[PDB]
Amino acid sequence: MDKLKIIMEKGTERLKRGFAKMVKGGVIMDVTNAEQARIAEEAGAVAVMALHKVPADIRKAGGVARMAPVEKIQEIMDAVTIPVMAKCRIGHEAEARILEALGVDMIDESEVLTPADPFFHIYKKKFTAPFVCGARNLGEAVRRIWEGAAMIRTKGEAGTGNIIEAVRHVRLVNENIRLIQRMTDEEIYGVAEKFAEPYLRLAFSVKEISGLPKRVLENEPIYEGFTYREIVEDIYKILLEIKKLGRLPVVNFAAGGVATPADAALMMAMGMDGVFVGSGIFKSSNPPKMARAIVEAVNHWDEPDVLAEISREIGEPMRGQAIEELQVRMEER
Amino acid sequence: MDKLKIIMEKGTERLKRGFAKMVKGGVIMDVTNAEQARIAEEAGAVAVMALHKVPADIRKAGGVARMAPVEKIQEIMDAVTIPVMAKCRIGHEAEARILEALGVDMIDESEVLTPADPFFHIYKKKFTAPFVCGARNLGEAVRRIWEGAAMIRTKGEAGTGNIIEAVRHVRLVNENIRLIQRMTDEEIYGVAEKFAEPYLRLAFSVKEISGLPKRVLENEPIYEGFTYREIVEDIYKILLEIKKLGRLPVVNFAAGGVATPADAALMMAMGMDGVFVGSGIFKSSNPPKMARAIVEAVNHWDEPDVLAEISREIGEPMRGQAIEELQVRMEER
Amino acid sequence: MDKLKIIMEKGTERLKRGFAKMVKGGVIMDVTNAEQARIAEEAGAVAVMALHKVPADIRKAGGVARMAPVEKIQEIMDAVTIPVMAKCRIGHEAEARILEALGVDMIDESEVLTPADPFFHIYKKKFTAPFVCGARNLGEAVRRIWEGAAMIRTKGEAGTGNIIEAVRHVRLVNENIRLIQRMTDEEIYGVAEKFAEPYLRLAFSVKEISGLPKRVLENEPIYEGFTYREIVEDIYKILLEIKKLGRLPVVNFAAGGVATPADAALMMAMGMDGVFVGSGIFKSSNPPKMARAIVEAVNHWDEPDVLAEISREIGEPMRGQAIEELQVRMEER
Amino acid sequence: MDKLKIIMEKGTERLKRGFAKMVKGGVIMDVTNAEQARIAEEAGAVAVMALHKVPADIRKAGGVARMAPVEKIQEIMDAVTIPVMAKCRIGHEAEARILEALGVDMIDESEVLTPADPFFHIYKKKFTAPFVCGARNLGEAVRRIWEGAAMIRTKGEAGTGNIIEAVRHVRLVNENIRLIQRMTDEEIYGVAEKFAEPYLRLAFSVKEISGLPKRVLENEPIYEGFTYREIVEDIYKILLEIKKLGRLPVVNFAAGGVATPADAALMMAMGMDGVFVGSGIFKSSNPPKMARAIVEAVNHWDEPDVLAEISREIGEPMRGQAIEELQVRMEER
Amino acid sequence: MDKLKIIMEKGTERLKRGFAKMVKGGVIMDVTNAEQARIAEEAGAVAVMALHKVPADIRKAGGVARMAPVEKIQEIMDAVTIPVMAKCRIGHEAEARILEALGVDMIDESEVLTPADPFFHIYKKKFTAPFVCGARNLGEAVRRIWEGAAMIRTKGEAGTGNIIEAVRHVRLVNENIRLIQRMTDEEIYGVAEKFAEPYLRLAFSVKEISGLPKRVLENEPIYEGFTYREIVEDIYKILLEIKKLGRLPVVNFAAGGVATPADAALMMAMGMDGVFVGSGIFKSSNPPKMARAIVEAVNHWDEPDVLAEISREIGEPMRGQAIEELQVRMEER
Amino acid sequence: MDKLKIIMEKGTERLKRGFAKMVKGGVIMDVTNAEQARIAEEAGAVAVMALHKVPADIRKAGGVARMAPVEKIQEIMDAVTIPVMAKCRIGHEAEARILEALGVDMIDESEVLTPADPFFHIYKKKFTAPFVCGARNLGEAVRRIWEGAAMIRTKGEAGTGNIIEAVRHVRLVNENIRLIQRMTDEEIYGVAEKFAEPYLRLAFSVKEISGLPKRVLENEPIYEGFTYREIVEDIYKILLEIKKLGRLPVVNFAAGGVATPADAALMMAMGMDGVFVGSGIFKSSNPPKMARAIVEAVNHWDEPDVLAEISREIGEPMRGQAIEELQVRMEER
Ligand SMILES: *C[C@H](O)[C@H](O)[C@H](O)COP(=O)(O)O
Ligand SMILES: *C[C@H](O)[C@H](O)[C@H](O)COP(=O)(O)O
């Protein structure tokens, strides 16, 4: 009864996780239309990511960023043989189920789209389709995993062409893992308690409205039927798995502001499994050339001579500094 | 002049509440003119909401937003067979009585119009026409109900095309209900005390002007003849009814920033009875298509395959992020 | 003379007060010229209020707003049979004596004109002409009365077409009266002390300049010969009269941001004796229609069916939300 | 030893004070050129005030306002028979000596010109020409007198056409006089201490620079040879003289923002000896009419019927409000 | 060695100081080119100051202000017989050595040019050419002298045409001298300690970087070999010399914002030896006239009749205010 | 890694350090293209620095500044015989390895490019190519050295044409060396502790995320395998070497805002080994002239007569003041 529940939770999880492994070692490319899908595939993309506008443009446009039009996603799935992934707004369950129904290979609960739910992410374990989610540090990654993400990427700062935020997120996650490895089981439990705190945020908001103190009550269901303590337990388990593994239990990709072959190489060299690039490619002057270049960079990242030759023709990345990013997009939690 | 005022008034409450049930399961559409009224009806709207400008436009125009011109409301009631509802300024009793006299089916005391009274809402129990009111959390909803609202909706952030605020309000209300259900009667009484606090606001202002301390006096009439403690009692009663019911005693709709079929479906899927959409439809590129789409979305919300087919043609959208909403229309209390 | 002079002077207040009663139940309309005076009278205005520009325009123009040109006031008094009232700057004694000499029926010491005196209002008891004054709460109203105002109105926020500030002022006054009625005589005395505080303001400024502590000295003449304690006594008397009367001892009108018939009706329904409207009428698209409509609204305010019919044709101009009123004209004290 | 000099010292002061009395009861008009000098004289100005630009224009122009050009002052002295006064920068001794050498009848050490000395005013006693100075309260007036001013005016807010600041200054001065009259000699001495404080400002600046504490040293020469205590003594004397007199020992005029006949009347009615008006007249639409009108207003100020007839034709640009005066010219001290 | 060193320090210092005396009693004029040099000489300038742009223009141009081009300085030295002085950036030793090699008569280490060294001024004693330096108070002047300045001027606010800052600086210096004269030798030693503080600024910055407390260490070499205590001793000596002398041991000129003959006269009348004017003359409408006028003003500054005649044609000149000077240029310490 | 990796690290380090010595005594010029490379070489540049845009332009352009296109670097290495150096983003390891592969003679880890890593610099010891790094004080310089920099320069404020920041950094470094020389070994150890602090920054961020206190743990690996204490030890060694040497163990150049021959001369005269100039030359009006001039200035820096002659024709680089540098590029740490 209980044990069988626990059993499909795990067989299905492992299957979903399994899909992610297919995409490992390659580049996944944001694509807004049939053409771009083709350019992407032709350039050696392991898969494309369908959205309405690339993040750089999302930034320029302002307003609300939602799931791509169904027509567009269709058109893209038709244009290519490789897996098609698509983006949905954080917490927006309906968008995800439409995406799943449409037959996309993976759904990305994306912090670049305007979040739908201020409190919770989608509960991903309920879906058949596998999810990829963003994380700016290990707490985030673990929560996202616990909610059922089959793959995680760094958030970085999307559409900025600036690799710094991606690098920060990778280092934060990695150092946090190494810290876990140096801890006693009990200490790790404390970290698990900290990492589950965000789920309390609804509850506490409501305690405040009701003129009660903001306290965690032991039998109080917080999220999707789970008690705070229950979440702390499950997370704790995941942290232990991580301590053993030395890395994340799922495929872990670098994302955001990859603008040049060297950028991609750098991420790979930091121990990432693969690279997501949207804006770097199509906001570039020669998109197909840049595409192929980044692919070859990810395949050759440990070979400086090759990296050097790979980067001999293209004209871009473009722009957006520390000062005036105007919507710092690494917030979901 | 008997138990007449107790047992008749309750009969009337239940009647008023009764009207609201007619509209349940469907979409109510903001409409500024005869044409839009028609497109709405034709698209399967269960009812239309008459106002001068759709919220998105209200925002753009600035200045004072009042009740629609009587001519316009008339014109709209003529154009369609389904119920016509109309908006009035918070606390503006005269506007409401004119609306009622005009024979509208329901009056919305709306936080999207410029509030008329900084202290109090309209005392709705005195009206024959039934009222719908906005709420951003349970305290608000309960107060609104106590004042005689027959139906409540979430405020969301009107005219932003952003579903986040609506979702926040639904979650706050729901979690607060679950919290009530886990409470002893005495604890619930405490919450009732907290929920009645806002009525003291005009008393306290005057105490301060009078150089007295701001204190609640036991026999002091605060609002429409009621003592603070009296309000606390009635509210408490309502809370208890909620505890039993597991939901609100009246029809409860989602509103504010529904921009796409998926949005409406998400609201339905969170347990709302129905959806209000103004700006999402007529600020969209193909209003009739979007209208019918949202209707069919609300009818088919638990069927992802249908949702998917339903949103295959429309071009539509809106502005309004987070940053620079410039108005933040989620205030009435 | 002594005893005769006394007699004359005591009964003078009641006479002045008496004039105010003539205007009770109707609408007083701001008018800048002969035509507007005519339209006003024709529309059933009980009286006109002569000024250089209507408040909405006063706002737009910036700069210093003074008494209207004598020529203009003349021209207006000639154009109509009903009482002509005129505005003067707060504390500007000369402007008022010129107004009185010109034979206006009432002088309004108006917070919409640029105040002349940062410390004191005109001492109105010395005038033969009766004064109307603005008040945003009971303290203000009582002080203005004590200085000899024969009639008081709410300040509201003039020229905004927004009824909210008017409503706030009405409620603050009323609640403060109810509070008074629930008080022991001694308590009321305390309120009297609080209400007379503002007169100390020029004393204290000078104490500070002189390097002395800011203290009330018992025999020190503050205003027009009166000691602070003397003022406290007179005010206390007036408060007691209010406690008895249940309202203000003088005719009390609603003013500012009345934009539509329903607005005026609302004010009447809150227990006001009558309505001042300047901007609502002439900044409206169809001023004579709006004028007559507001008059008929005030006459028919308890009759929703009539209010409804009354409001069937007009198109009036509205502006000035909460955000960016830029002037906030509710200051005199 | 020293005996006879006292007579001399008193003698000159009284003579200087003398000249001021000639101008009492009338209007002094700012004039920038020969024509305005003429219009002014013709209109019954007792004297003209020569400057480069009228204060309103001084405001508009920004930059440094000095000393009118010598040619211009000459040209003005030629154009009229009445006394010519001229403005100089605060503390600018050279400008004053040139003005005196040029044979002006009075020098105004004016807070409307850009101050020359951040610490001290001109030591006026050393001059043969008599000085008029501004004061925004009694401390200021007394200091200015002690430095040898033969006449003082209120500062008001020059060029604003707003009488408020003038009225404030008059009230502050008057109430401070009445406060003096109610004081024991010892108390008055305290006020004298406070009023002499500003002279310490350059001493203390230097103590701070020298890393000493900011203290008053008893034998230390602050200003023009005088010890702080010495100044406190002389000031005390002047305060006593004021207590006896009930007013200032010198001719006292109202100044700044007088824009209309009623304004001038109001100042006279508050007990001022006369009125300075620059901007009110020549920034008016009909300068000669307005000029004559203000003159007749000052002659007839206690006669409302006359005031009323007097202001039957003119109309005059007047710009600036409380908000955004941008300069706030009442600072010298 | 030991005994000859002093004779030599004294000898060279005294010679350098000697040059300054040649220029005493006259006007030194900022000049950007051959023509201006000529106009200056012709007008009775005792010397010219060569720079790229006059201070008013320096302000307008923004960017970095350096030593004039060598060609320009050459061209100027050729154009005139009187001494040519030239400006260099604070602390910029190389610019000064080039100026000296070019054979200028005096170098000005100027706070109007963009400072080169945030910590220290040029050590002037090492140079054969004599230096003039700015000071806004006595501490500054003394430090500048100790570093070997042969002449000092007030900083004022350069390019503003506003004499106020010059006057402030003159007063601060003078009062601080008078304070010195009233002090015991020990007290003066304290002031010496205070005046030598700024040299510690680069030491303390480094202590903070090194994680040490900011303390003065007794044998620690702060500046050009000198220990802090050593500097306090030398400074103390100079202070004593000042106490005896009643003034500064070097020629002391007024500088900055002298815009009119009366300005220059005022400076002279405050006990300055002479006047620097750049902007006042060439930003004037009639530069040669203004130039000659200011010269003649300095020559007859105690003769009001003459000053008055001297100022009969020119206009205006220049402008700035307190508000928005945008680069307050009196800093360097 | 026992006794042979002390001597073998000495070998490679000393070789790398050796290359730097080749460039000592000359000017290194930023160059964006073939032509500038040529002009540079022709003008006596010891080496060129290849980048996409000169720092002044980097500032103007905003956006992300990365490594130069490979084509451009190639083109430059072809155009000249002297060493070609190239810039890379801080911490961007891939860019550096591509640069090294391309065969550049030196890599500059430059704070003028957009940093890639918010936590760490490239670990330079692992590279065969030698690195030059920027430092704003001794702590920085030492850390950069420990990471394996073979040469260090001051950061200054790049592209501002303002020598002040360069001078500040030189003084800060120098005074901190002198401070070191005055310290006991134990004291120096404390400085070593302080200088190693920045490495803890990513550890502590992660401790905070994990809800632990921010503490240094003794066996915890921080950077490239090293424990905090280990770094403290290595740094301490370097400090001691500095104490002996009286300067930095590597070639030390001045950089940042050198705009004129005198600037370069000043730097040399402060004891720098040579000068970097990008913007000063090519943003100048006559680049070749200015180039040769700065070279000859660095060769002749102790000869004022020569400096003087050397600076006789050129004009330019208006650049950027203290106010509104808008970027403040001296941050890496
Ligand atoms: C969908 C995902 O957010 C996207 O692929 C990455 O964040 C990339 O952002 P960018 O590479 O387009 O800047
Ligand atoms: C001048 C008089 O008080 C005026 O009519 C009121 O302020 C009403 O203003 P509004 O109704 O024109 O806003």
Short account of what is shown:
With 333 residues, chain A is α/β, with parallel strands linked by helices. Chain A has 14 helices and ten strands.
Bound compounds, please? ribose-5-phosphate
The count of domains of chain A is: 1
Oligomer: homohexamer
The percentage of residues in β strands of chain A lies in 5-15%
Shape of chain A: globular
Largest interface: which pair? D-E, 41 and 46 residues
CATH architecture of chain A: Alpha-Beta Barrel
Helix run count of chain A: 14
Arrangement of strands in the largest sheet of chain A: 1-2-3-4-5-6-9-10
Termini distance of chain A?
33 Å
Output the CATH topology of chain A: TIM Barrel
So, the CATH homologous superfamily of chain A? Aldolase class I
Total strand segments of chain A: 10
- Measured on Cα atoms, how large is the radius of gyration of chain A? 20 Å
Sheet with most strands of chain A:
8 strands, parallel, barrel
Q: Order of SSEs of chain A, N→C?
A: HEHEHHEHEEHEHHHEEHEHEHHH
Helix content of chain A: 40-55%
PDB class: lyase
Keywords: Pyrococcus horikoshii, pdxS, pyridoxal biosynthesis lyase, pyridoxal 5 -phosphate (PLP), lyase
Assembly: hexameric
Entry title: Crystal structure of pyridoxal biosynthesis lyase PdxS from Pyrococcus
How does this structure look, described?
The PDB classes it as lyase. The entry lists the keywords pdxS, pyridoxal biosynthesis lyase, pyridoxal 5 -phosphate (PLP). Six copies of one chain form a homohexamer. The first copy, chain A, is α/β, with parallel strands linked by helices and 333 residues long. Chain A has a single domain (1-333), classed as TIM Barrel, CATH 3.20.20.70. Chain A is built from 14 helices and ten strands. Chain A has helices at 2-23, 34-42, 55-61, 70-79, 93-101, 138-146, 164-181, 185-196, 201-209, 228-245, 261-269, 279-282, 287-300, 304-310; strands at residues 27-31, 47-50, 84-89, 106-110, 131-135, 151-154, 221-223, 226-227, 251-255, 275-277. In chain A, the strands form two sheets. In chain A, strands 1-2-3-4-5-6-9-10 form an eight-stranded parallel β-barrel, surrounded by eight helices. Chain A has a two-stranded antiparallel ribbon with strand order 7-8. In chain A, strand 3, helix 5 and strand 4 form a beta-alpha-beta unit. In chain A, helix 7 packs across helix 10 and helix 11 packs parallel to helix 13. Chain A is globular, with a radius of gyration of 20 Å. In chain A, 59% of the residues are buried. Chains in contact: A-B, A-F, B-C, C-D, D-E, E-F. The structure holds ribose-5-phosphate (2 copies).
